């Protein structure tokens, strides 16, 4: 019982995908390797079914059909990402501009506009050119800032006359934590048997992201935003963190758990330093901002994008690592009673009021002028052995989105200036360390044959958007 009239005249309803998960054609039209091609090819064991995004779901050859399907659902906007290494094979500008590369994105952009679909573009969705990881360690070096900044500038120039929404980075917490603390994600650093140091590297990498983030945002405000009349921001993820009980020890835990996950990026962009509790507890292992980078980081975004899957309970805790540095034990149970229904892999619990609380908190802690819910979606098992006819009827996903839009409407009613909701995965796609064992899509993809077919959630979505 949520209808489009309950939202402002002015809200956007979209869906999204990313380049490495969707595009495929990894070795076609002169794309250079990313760290995800490498991770996935040199480390198949690190991938649950040893699969990869070589072909992924083949969006690079099927974009016309895919746009057709977007228009059939009535998407108002589609969020996608540019593969850095599809436009610049070696990351830097010395190694070339790939014109096959840039023709693909012009084709893909013009086709979205021809079908009334507004394009919203991410610069960096984890797919770092492998040449830059090789040369100087990617985000392990400050050298990434200028290289990212030229990639950004090329993108503003080459595409920016048709595009109004720009995101610098999607989930740098996941990229930094899962890539350098846990060794789960490219480049596979910091866990047992991996190169790296999970106590150092996650912090260096996040510092270099925030500086990279800032150069691109200054590029855009100073050289592109008056002519192109668009807006630039960053995508932050967080779980909501509920106190296990209503004792101060647990409130202190919530505030540290949020701080290490959301404040780590959002406190630089509000006051120009990391949060209090990160400085206390990580100490010399947390880099300092210059007085110039600190001052220039205040307000450095036009919007915050917020990705949200779930909530956990939080209480005080009992080898140094980013994983242990907040001091928070997380559990999904209270008195053996889960905080909401447990989905396929065991991590995601449907918790709609988690969204509400996480959007109110971001506004009272950071005073964000413009919020978007940039990823909101549910995981489902990839069940081989059933007919597409049963796989299609994903009533649980339609109820999922309904309830979260309820929370998103509730936050708007309590003054949070949230301006959009974007269903995560439009299409079933490649799922990083889980390869193809699950699905988040509202359109079904046969992972092998690439055929597309709408689930019932897509048709619920079409109907909702048309209200």
Ligand X SMILES: OC[C@@H]1[C@@H](O)[C@H](O)[C@@H](O)[C@@H]1NC1CCCCC1
Among the residue ranges 166-174, 207-215, 328-336, 395-403, the one whose residues contact ligand X (CB under 6 A):
166-174
Site size with ligand X, rule: CB under 6 A:
10
Residue 174 binds ligand X, judged by CB under 6 A:
yes
- DSSP bridge partners of 81: 122
Number of other CB atoms surrounding residue 360 within 10 Å: 17
Q: DSSP for 134-175?
A: HHH-GGGSTTHHHHHHHHHHHHHHHHTTS--EEEEEE-HHHH
Distant-in-sequence, close-in-space partners of 174: CB < 8 Å, separation ≥ 6:
126, 185, 237
The CA distances from residue 329 to 132, 243, 252, 257, in Å, are 36, 11, 12, 9
Residue 184 binds ligand X, judged by CB under 6 A:
no
DSSP percent split of the chain into helix, strand, coil, nearest 5: 45, 20, 35
- HSE-CB at 365 with a 13 A cutoff on CA atoms is 20
In the residue annotation, 135 being an active-site residue is answered as no
Task: Report the nearest approach of ligand X to the CB of residue 34 (Å).
Answer: 14
Task: Report the nearest approach of ligand X to the CB of residue 208 (Å).
Answer: 20
Task: Report the nearest approach of ligand X to the CB of residue 285 (Å).
Answer: 23
Q: Which is nearer to ligand X, 309 or 436 (CB)?
A: 309
As a whole number of Å, the end-to-end CA separation of the chain is 13
Residue 312 binds ligand X, judged by CB under 6 A:
no
In the residue annotation, 23 being an active-site residue is answered as no
Q: Which is nearer to ligand X, 206 or 307 (CB)?
A: 307
98 marked ligand binding residue: no
Q: Which is nearer to ligand X, 43 or 141 (CB)?
A: 43
Q: Which is nearer to ligand X, 21 or 228 (CB)?
A: 21
375 marked ligand binding residue: yes
What residues from 348 to 387 belong to the interface with ligand X (CB under 6 A)? 375
Sign of the CA dihedral running 117, 118, 120, 121: positive
Distance of CA 25 to the CA centre of its chain: 22
Q: Which is nearer to ligand X, 18 or 130 (CB)?
A: 18
Residue 127 binds ligand X, judged by CB under 6 A:
no
264 marked ligand binding residue: no
Task: Report the nearest approach of ligand X to the CB of residue 247 (Å).
Answer: 29
- Strand order of the β-sheet with 328-331 is 240-243, 311-316, 328-331
**Active-site choice (133, 184, 201, 375):** 375
**Active-site choice (153, 171, 201, 267):** 171
- DSSP bridge partners of 315: 329
Among the residue ranges 58-66, 139-147, 169-177, 452-460, the one whose residues contact ligand X (CB under 6 A):
169-177
21 marked ligand binding residue: yes
Q: Which of 307, 376, 407, 457 binds ligand X (CB under 6 A)?
A: 307
- Select the residue whose beta carbon is closest to ligand X and give its number: 174
402 marked ligand binding residue: no
CA pair distance 293, 152, nearest whole angstrom? 19
- DSSP bridge partners of 338: 333
- DSSP bridge partners of 240: 311
Task: Report the nearest approach of ligand X to the CB of residue 38 (Å).
Answer: 18
Q: Which is nearer to ligand X, 184 or 410 (CB)?
A: 184
Distant-in-sequence, close-in-space partners of 16: CB < 8 Å, separation ≥ 6:
78, 79, 80, 120, 374, 375, 422, 423, 424, 425, 426
Task: Report the nearest approach of ligand X to the CB of residue 224 (Å).
Answer: 25
Q: Which of 13, 18, 140, 176 binds ligand X (CB under 6 A)?
A: 18
What residues from 392 to 431 belong to the interface with ligand X (CB under 6 A)? 424
125 marked ligand binding residue: yes
Q: What angle do CA 313, 317, 319 make, to 5 degrees?
A: 125
Map residues 61-80 to x or -, x wherever contact with ligand X holds by CB under 6 A.
Answer: --------------------
Task: Report the nearest approach of ligand X to the CB of residue 377 (Å).
Answer: 7
203 marked ligand binding residue: no
CA pair distance 272, 286, nearest whole angstrom? 14
Contact, 453 vs 388, CB < 8 A? yes
Q: Which of 237, 312, 315, 457 binds ligand X (CB under 6 A)?
A: 237
Contact, 447 vs 436, CB < 8 A? yes
No. of helices (H) and no. of strands (E), the chain = 20, 17
Task: Report the nearest approach of ligand X to the CB of residue 266 (Å).
Answer: 16
Closest CA to 401 of 419, 370, 426, 384: 426
Q: Which is nearer to ligand X, 126 or 224 (CB)?
A: 126
Binding site membership: which residues? 21, 125, 170-171, 309, 375, 424, 431-432, 440
Q: Which residues are catalytically annotated?
A: 171, 375
Chain positions contacting ligand X, by CB under 6 A: 18, 170-171, 174, 237, 307, 309, 375, 424, 440
Binding site membership for a beta-D-glucoside: which residues? 21, 125, 170-171, 309, 375, 424, 431-432, 440
């Amino acid at each position: 019982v949520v209808h489009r009239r309950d939202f402002p005249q002015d809200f956007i309803f979209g869906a999204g995908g990313s380049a490495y998960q969707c595009e495929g054609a990894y070795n076609e039209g002169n794309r250079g390797p990313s760290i995800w091609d490498t991770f996935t090819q040199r480390s198949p064991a690190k991938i649950s079914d040893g699969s990869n995004g070589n072909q992924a779901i083949n969006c690079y050859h099927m974009y016309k059909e895919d746009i057709k399907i977007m228009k059939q659902t009535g998407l108002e906007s589609y969020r996608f990402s540019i593969s850095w290494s599809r436009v610049l094979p070696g990351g830097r500008l010395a190694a070339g501009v790939n014109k096959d590369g840039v023709k693909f994105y012009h084709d893909f952009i013009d086709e979205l506009l021809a079908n009334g679909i507004k394009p919203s573009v991410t610069l960096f969705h984890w797919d770092l050119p492998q040449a830059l990881e090789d040369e100087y360690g990617g985000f392990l070096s400050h050298r990434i800032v200028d290289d990212f900044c030229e990639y950004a500038e090329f993108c503003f120039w080459e595409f920016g006359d048709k595009i109004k929404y720009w995101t610098t980075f999607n989930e740098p917490h996941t990229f930094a934590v899962n890539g350098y603390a846990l060794g789960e994600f490219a480049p596979g650093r910091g866990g047992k048997g991996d190169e790296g140091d999970p106590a150092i590297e996650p912090y260096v990498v996040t510092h270099n992201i925030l500086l990279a983030h800032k150069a691109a945002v200054e590029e855009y405000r100073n050289k592109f935003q008056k002519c192109q009349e668009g807006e630039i921001g960053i995508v932050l993820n967080s779980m909501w963190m509920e106190p296990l009980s209503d004792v101060q020890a647990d409130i202190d835990a919530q505030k540290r758990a949020l701080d290490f996950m959301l404040g780590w990026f959002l406190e630089p962009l509000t006051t120009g330093d990391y949060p209090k509790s990160m400085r206390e507890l990580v100490k010399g292992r947390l880099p300092k901002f210059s007085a110039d980078d600190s001052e220039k980081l205040k307000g450095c975004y036009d919007f915050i994008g917020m990705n949200y899957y779930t909530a956990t309970y939080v209480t005080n805790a009992v080898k140094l690592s980013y994983e242990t540095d907040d001091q928070v034990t997380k559990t999904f149970e209270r008195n053996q009673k889960p905080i909401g229904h447990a989905l396929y892999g065991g991590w995601q619990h449907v918790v709609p009021w988690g969204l509400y609380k996480l959007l109110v908190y971001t506004k009272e802690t950071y005073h964000v002028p413009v919020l978007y819910v940039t990823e909101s979606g549910m995981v489902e098992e990839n069940k081989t052995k059933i007919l597409l006819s049963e796989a299609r009827r994903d009533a649980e996903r339609t109820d999922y989105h309904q309830k979260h839009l309820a929370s998103v409407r509730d936050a708007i009613d309590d003054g949070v200036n949230v301006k959009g909701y974007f269903v995560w995965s439009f299409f079933d796609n490649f799922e990083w360390n889980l390869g193809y064992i699950c699905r988040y899509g509202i359109i079904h993809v046969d992972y092998k044959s690439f055929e597309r077919y709408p689930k019932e959630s897509a048709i619920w979505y079409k109907n909702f958007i048309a209200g």
